[PDB]
Design a protein around this ligand. Sequence first.
Ligand SMILES: CCCc1cc2c(NCCc3ccc(OCc4nnn[nH]4)cc3)nc(OC)nc2s1
Ligand SMILES: *[C@@H]1O[C@H](CO)[C@@H](O)[C@H](O)[C@H]1NC(C)=O
Ligand SMILES: *[C@@H]1O[C@H](CO)[C@@H](O)[C@H](O)[C@H]1NC(C)=O
Ligand SMILES: N[C@@H](CCC(=O)O)C(=O)O
Ligand SMILES: N[C@@H](CCC(=O)O)C(=O)O
Lengths: 764, 760
Amino acid sequence: KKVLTLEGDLVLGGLFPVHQKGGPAEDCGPVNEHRGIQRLEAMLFALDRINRDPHLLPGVRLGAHILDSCSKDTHALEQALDFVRASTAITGVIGGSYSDVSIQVANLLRLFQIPQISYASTSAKLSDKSRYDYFARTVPPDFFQAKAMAEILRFFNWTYVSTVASEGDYGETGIEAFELEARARNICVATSEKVGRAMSRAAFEGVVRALLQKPSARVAVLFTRSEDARELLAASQRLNASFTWVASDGWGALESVVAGSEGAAEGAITIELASYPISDFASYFQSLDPWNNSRNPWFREFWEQRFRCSFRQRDCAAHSLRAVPFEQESKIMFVVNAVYAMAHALHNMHRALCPNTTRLCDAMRPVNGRRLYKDFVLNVKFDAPFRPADTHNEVRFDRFGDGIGRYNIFTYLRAGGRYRYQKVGYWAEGLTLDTSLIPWASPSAGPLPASRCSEPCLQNEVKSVQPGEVCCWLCIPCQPYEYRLDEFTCADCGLGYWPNASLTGCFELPQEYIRWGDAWAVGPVTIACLGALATLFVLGVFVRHNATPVVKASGRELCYILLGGVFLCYCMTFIFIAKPSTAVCTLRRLGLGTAFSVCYSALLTKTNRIARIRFISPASQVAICLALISGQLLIVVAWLVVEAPGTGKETAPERREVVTLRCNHRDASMLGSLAYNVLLIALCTLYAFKTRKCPENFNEAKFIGFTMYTTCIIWLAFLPIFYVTSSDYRVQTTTMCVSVSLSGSVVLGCLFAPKLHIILFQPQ
Amino acid sequence: KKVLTLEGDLVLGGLFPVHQKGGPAEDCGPVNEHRGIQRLEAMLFALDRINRDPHLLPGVRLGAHILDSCSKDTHALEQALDFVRASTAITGVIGGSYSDVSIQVANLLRLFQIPQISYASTSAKLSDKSRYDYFARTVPPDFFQAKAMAEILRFFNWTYVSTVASEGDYGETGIEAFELEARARNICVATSEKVGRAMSRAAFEGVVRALLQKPSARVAVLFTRSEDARELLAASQRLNASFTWVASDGWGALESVVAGSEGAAEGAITIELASYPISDFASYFQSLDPWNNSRNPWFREFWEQRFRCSFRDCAAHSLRAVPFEQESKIMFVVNAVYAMAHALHNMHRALCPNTTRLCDAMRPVNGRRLYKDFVLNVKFDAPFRPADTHNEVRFDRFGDGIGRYNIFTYLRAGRYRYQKVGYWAEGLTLDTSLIPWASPSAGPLPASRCSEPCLQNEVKSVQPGEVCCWLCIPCQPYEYRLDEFTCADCGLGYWPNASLTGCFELPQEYIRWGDAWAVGPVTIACLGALATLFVLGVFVRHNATPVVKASGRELCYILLGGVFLCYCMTFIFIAKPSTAVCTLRRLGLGTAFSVCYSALLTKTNRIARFISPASQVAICLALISGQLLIVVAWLVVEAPGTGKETAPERREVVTLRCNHRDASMLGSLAYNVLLIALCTLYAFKTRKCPENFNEAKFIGFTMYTTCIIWLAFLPIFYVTSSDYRVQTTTMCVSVSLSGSVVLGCLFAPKLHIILFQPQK
Ligand SMILES: CCCc1cc2c(NCCc3ccc(OCc4nnn[nH]4)cc3)nc(OC)nc2s1
Ligand SMILES: *[C@@H]1O[C@H](CO)[C@@H](O)[C@H](O)[C@H]1NC(C)=O
Ligand SMILES: *[C@@H]1O[C@H](CO)[C@@H](O)[C@H](O)[C@H]1NC(C)=O
Ligand SMILES: N[C@@H](CCC(=O)O)C(=O)O
Ligand SMILES: N[C@@H](CCC(=O)O)C(=O)O
């Protein structure tokens, strides 16, 4: 209901938010001590400085008609009728501390052609000159704050965040640009909330809970007014929640937002417009008292709110503004600039429109607002008022009547104890953060907070993206034989190889075979050596005593061939344990049959000659034995011609199983040669059953039959053991040896023990 | 720049979109015919009918001051300055069509206390009476169309959808409400697009292409103004793109939107406010011609545009010959005018009781009184109503209407037409028979979803909070799925049913009686049993024969019996296991071996060296009963049971096994081994004299052979403990061979000398 009026030739209107938006019962409550009173005193100070300037409007004195908007658009629009009710007359309006108020006032003012310059309105909608064609401002739009915030988020690897925004033209227009800029930097948003004009504490707690619903998103982005930010921070403190805040210029660097909720706000990052303090305004504002500053109608209420006193008790005289500290507001410069800009415009008009006189002129009595705005408002160019030493600034408007984009970045920190605000880098055309000043980001404290949906998969895991969400992937493990060729897919190697340590490689593994130094090779080798030594000893004994009647009673040539066969029977253990080659496989295929053929042929001839006792000479006997041996050899030669002498490396469903080196298919030759021997054995047994006759010095073929029986029992009992363990061929070939050696040892003991018994125990 | 003025005692304002929005070049474009001239003539007709009624304002003549908004808010406000310049006087303002114009005008009018009633304005923001405290309307808000659309997009199963909006209050608020309602029902928005105030053809084509980038969403939900819809349809026709359109009342049922783009628009579904046609208005409009309708300044431009003629050969045409199609919202305009008239009549009756002409008290009408006590409390029969209807005019606490809607489809008959298929008041009802593609035998319904349904055997896993999309995953071949999200184990020894929800205990397994591995011995055992029966019969018959007389005992008959029992035991090993079968196997094996070796223990003892016909039998029976004692004690200690086996890589493989472990048998075999070491020892000590027919060296040979067999067999058993099939085959073969050795080695010479060569 109050208005500030100062007489002058030309009157400039003003609009400031002196009072905060009251509650339901009352339209307007408490006073704004920083964004209200100080800005108004700045405008008054600029007017006073202009009115004693000889170079700027020497003969024209500027008046003022200042109103209060009370942070509400309807109240501001109701008050704004005073500017247009005259058509005293108002040339232009320096106003706007909010975007809704500015838009509503511009919509009304454009119908009467009244220029308007704003000092704090940063909405992008106002750059459309087809809708708002009477408007200028000294601040940049919100097109660049979204870019700055997106780059700040991208710097710290924050890819999963949450946006809280306010309702109107500042909050939604800013968040749409932030969402576009996030899209252009591969970022992703989880949830979105909005705050209404009328909101209670319970709804704020609901917003906090909705933010807490997603635990992975620990970063909250705010495009909010100061009151909404204060209430949200208070609610978060009450509910004991912890977030890392990134806020717009609504929070700025105000101390009232974080008053009483210091614990919740610590570690936040905020953006503010770049500015400097003015030295004259401090000395001007620190000399004001209610008994001299009569022209301001809202000063006494501010005095009572500030110093907590009352003029009724006559106790407010002691207090003074000098003793208490002074913290100048950020946008004061902008306010001063706006006023000076308008002044300069009018000066140029007065210089061009009528150069004859210095006072006002009959042509310029009713000022034209189209000419003034279109020609002179947008073409102003001067040096900034009260500029700090060694710094250069300038006052200009773009095509859209907007300012220049420069911002400063602040953190809230806990001192060594009171809380203060510090610069952490500029932002002009690209970020320039200095990470040393932020406490939460020096590495002594800990690693930087995290805001990702899903953690990075391991080198052995692969990524399969879930449809509908880029930021979140599910890790998977590859088969143990599989290597990871690319980030989102892995393949398997060709059989015979194994993944590299880095798992981006294929490597041929260790070919495995039985080795000489193994105990499983040592044992059979020792047994074979002992058998060979025993055979040599028996041969040496028979040779040494070759003239005794008992030795002469038996054949000597057949004894020698049988001893040689026994020796070959033993040597095969050693042949069959040797590393496979081009020659060793041939010996493995040959010697088994050769040994059986030699031994069984010797037995056959011995029984044949005893049974017959034609062609009984020691040479007919040698010929028959050699023919019987050569028969088996014929088959081996044929097999060598029929099949291929070679080897093979295999694999099995269990791919881990190493590629063993084995000989080629040996089915037909071995089994057939089996016949070259088992049939011969059967004939020998038959002739032994027929040799029971004509007893010789011995002719106890009861021993040869027993030998054959024991051999059949032996081998025939290896067949169950084999299938039992068809794997581990290295241990598989630890039965063929130990059966062949046993058969040979049975034959040797059977044939030689009675003769040695006679040789030793009796003279005969 | 032109104004329509009619004199009267009281004046009502008006605001209609007579002209379409012009381009960058000019302020005002071509004339708008349906939401223009028709509505303006409806208002004029309502005023003239009110100005000749016995019961409503009999002594006061109402005037009019009607302006043009040209589809722009800035132009509408510049024109609306005329209403407040008096502060002639304006009693009320029958206001905007589009929501932006209404909001802009209301912001200015609330300052001077001038009531306003709108038509066709459906924005939700206007329901907030803290800001627009002088605004009323006869149409419901946009809070219910979102519900209607979300239920049409759920009757048919659509879940990946796209949205297109117009910049401004109407489109943005509507899309926000629709998104909330869709989330509430599990409907998910694929992509979101916006249309600006000034958009070129390339921008519309870009919007179409952006819609065409995600290809599962084939349904587009438009909540936009009519001109944007027309331009988007033209762009879609040019680029040969096909979608299913769901539109709000901005499209409505206008023929202008679908002029020349019939192919792209076919099959669309739109929503319109519920209304009826008035019959007096048709003849009123159809009777107009430019020579007598001189009070309307915009009529000649409409005539020129409509009939394509120039007044500078215009009299040949007539409006009666052409068909007439009434616009949907004529009733609402008539209702608004009548509501204002009734409010003024009631106020006049309250304040000027003794006169019919205006009195001095009402001379400057008080806006705040008329609106707070008379406008919101009107109630009357809706005028020009159908013969059997009950529509009434009233306002709620927010000055709103009742929410009822109709639903239309666009089809080809060869002319095209709109067809009504249902309505929405509080619950959705629609007839799918009238829709061509929704009718049966036409084919499957158009589909739009993130993921197709999972297979029977598969399970879906999704990220948390992902309510629409689903990622299917195959469960393991041996797992029972608890619910769609998570598969689980079914149970050891069980396999999942065919339906993948049931589970069934696997069948057991035991040797099939026809496997050749087991068949081979059943035959060997039969042959051995036949031989034992033969030998027993021959020796039983010829007891008189001297070969029987020479040895003189019955341990031979015992031994034979034992041999027969050993073969019957090898019959009983290859059998279906049970408790009794386990006991029989665990008794008979030891019994048969101990019997045979005890017998030959007797004969070796007897020939080693009081020897009596009963002492030898007593020793044999004592050794047998000793073995029976041991086996019975060990069977009492370990109760016989049956079990089922399973293991780490068992893959549908079940088994039946005896509860007794293999190693527990070992003790009995140890016993028998010692027995053998004794029999052999004695057979070694008596290796010289042939007491009768050389019957000692044959006994020695038999002892050695049995020792060889046991030495060969024992490790094969331990090595083959791993595999059961080979174990049973080897056990059967070894036992059968061990019996055959004793038989053939000992009983062959006696049979040969008795039968083949009788010489005793
Ligand atoms: C009563 C009858 C006694 C006889 C037995 C007998 C016999 N038996 C051994 C047969 C056999 C077994 C497994 C093998 O797989 C193992 C392997 N092989 N190469 N690498 N690993 C290979 C061969 N071979 C032959 O000479 C051919 N003569 C005879 S006389
Ligand atoms: C952000 O991510 C990049 C990508 O690896 C990394 O190099 C950079 O260090 C991250 N930022 C910080 C502050 O660690
Ligand atoms: C939509 O899904 C429900 C759920 O199974 C189903 O009952 C209904 O039939 C579906 N709609 C149509 C048109 O089939
Ligand atoms: N930039 C803020 C104004 C805040 C202030 O007055 O400091 C807005 O446009 O909403
Ligand atoms: N109901 C639409 C206008 C559509 C019409 O003109 O009928 C709105 O609120 O903007």
